[PDB]
Structure 1
Amino acid sequence: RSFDIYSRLLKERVIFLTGQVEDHMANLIVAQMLFLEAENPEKDIYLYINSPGGVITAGMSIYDTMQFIKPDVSTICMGQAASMGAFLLTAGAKGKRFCLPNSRVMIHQPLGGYQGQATDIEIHAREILKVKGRMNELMALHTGQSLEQIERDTERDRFLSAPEAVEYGLVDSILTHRN
């Protein structure tokens, strides 16, 4: 009886990624993902996305589980998919990634901040550059775009309307009307 709306939508194999991406909320998407694999490792899974990004590693826990699990993971971004939100979005299974008409996307680069000794600082700094780069490769690969474009387009906050994210390979098309 729509006792719990989301639990109910989990029976249509739909999952919601909303807001701040961080460990726990991420973990709750993983746990859903896995649960759906088992309930049926053959049917498609739905990941709706309206988020501004967040802690990356947490963000990556979702990503790897989207690949790891048997079923294809379709993604539909509504409202906004930014930074890490844009990533998991374009990480949907090819041909199954969407954008509602006025949703909007944003890309940019790994953000961070360490504090301590010079020695330690080079350590964590070298690390963020590696991640900055991997994230760029994994993005080059899901978008079909060169490492040059990503690198340039992601050095600074960059926005895309629904048409443009399609035109960029980020999502495959625009769902305008449930026909």
Structure 2
Amino acid sequence: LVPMVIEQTSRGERSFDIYSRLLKERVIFLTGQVEDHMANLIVAQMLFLEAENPEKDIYLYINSPGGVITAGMSIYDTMQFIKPDVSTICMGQAASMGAFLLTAGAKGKRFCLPNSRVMIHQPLGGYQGQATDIEIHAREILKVKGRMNELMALHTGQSLEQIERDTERDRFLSAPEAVEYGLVDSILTH
């Protein structure tokens, strides 16, 4: 159940869901494992907000533990295309795709909470079967990692060699240390 909040208007009060009223204020929330339906839902919200206002920033709260990589790419390609800068405020955990989504955020508007934690590791698409088919599948995952790492380094600016070395094994970064690494430009506290 979602609480219904009335939004005062000159015509009169109209009841709306808590998420609905937040969307009216350019606030979009993200949570749960990334899914095609979930990714497409956040995509429709981004497009509607851009048409409503093409300048005001659209907030994007990421509190997800990671999900399918392919689903996440749709969100990333929709965020870059839209003219308004996305404010990727990380309010909690941020797995591989979680880190990728917040890093895609426009520079100068990315914020992080004091006690948030961003976990970055490599993608895992392990499949078992005939060696012939695995070759193409094996080639594909590296290409996504290379493409993601290339785009990731473009946003952050760190050396590609260092990023792959670190991303080979699971890495945990604190909110203070995250800004040092360049994941988030600033921290929001007050």
Q: With structure 1 as the length reference, what TM-score do the two structures score? A: 0.95
Tell whether the 8 Å contact from 1:143 to 1:169 is kept in structure 2 after alignment.
yes
Cα offsets for 1:24-68 (capped at 9, x unmatched): 111110000001111111111000111111101110100000001
Tell whether the 8 Å contact from 1:108 to 1:157 is kept in structure 2 after alignment.
yes
SS in 2 for 1:36: helix
Q: With structure 2 as the length reference, what TM-score do the two structures score? A: 0.90
> Where does structure 1 differ by over 4 angstroms across 4 or more consecutive aligned residues?
none
Tell whether the 8 Å contact from 1:49 to 1:89 is kept in structure 2 after alignment.
yes
Q: Does 1:111 align with 2:120?
A: no
Cα offsets for 1:143-169 (capped at 9, x unmatched): 111101110111111011111111111
Tell me how far apart the structure 2 counterparts of residues 90 and 9 of structure 1 sit (CA, whole Å).
23
Alignment RMSD, CA only?
A: 1.1
SS in 2 for 1:21: coil
SS in 1 for 2:91: strand
How many residue pairs end up in the alignment?
A: 177
Tell whether the 8 Å contact from 1:2 to 1:8 is kept in structure 2 after alignment.
no
SS in 2 for 1:35: helix
Change (3 A) 1:144 1:2: farther
Cα offsets for 1:2-33 (capped at 9, x unmatched): 63001100011010111211111111100000
Cα offsets for 1:66-125 (capped at 9, x unmatched): 001121111100111111001101111001111100000011101112233211110110
Tell me how far apart the structure 2 counterparts of residues 51 and 27 of structure 1 sit (CA, whole Å).
16
**Equivalent position to 1:132, from 142, 145, 148:** 145
Tell me how far apart the structure 2 counterparts of residues 116 and 40 of structure 1 sit (CA, whole Å).
49
Change (3 A) 1:104 1:8: same
SS in 2 for 1:76: coil
Q: Residue 32 of structure 1 aligns with which residue?
A: 45
Q: Aligned residues: percent identity? A: 100
Tell me how far apart the structure 2 counterparts of residues 164 and 149 of structure 1 sit (CA, whole Å).
16
Change (3 A) 1:11 1:104: same
SS in 1 for 2:84: coil
SS in 1 for 2:90: strand
Q: Residue 53 of structure 1 aligns with which residue?
A: 66
Change (3 A) 1:129 1:104: same
111-120 vs 32-41, which deviates more?
111-120
Tell me how far apart the structure 1 counterparts of residues 56 and 153 of structure 2 sit (CA, whole Å).
27
SS in 2 for 1:106: strand
Tell me how far apart the structure 1 counterparts of residues 51 and 105 of structure 2 sit (CA, whole Å).
19
Structure 1 unaligned runs (5+)? none
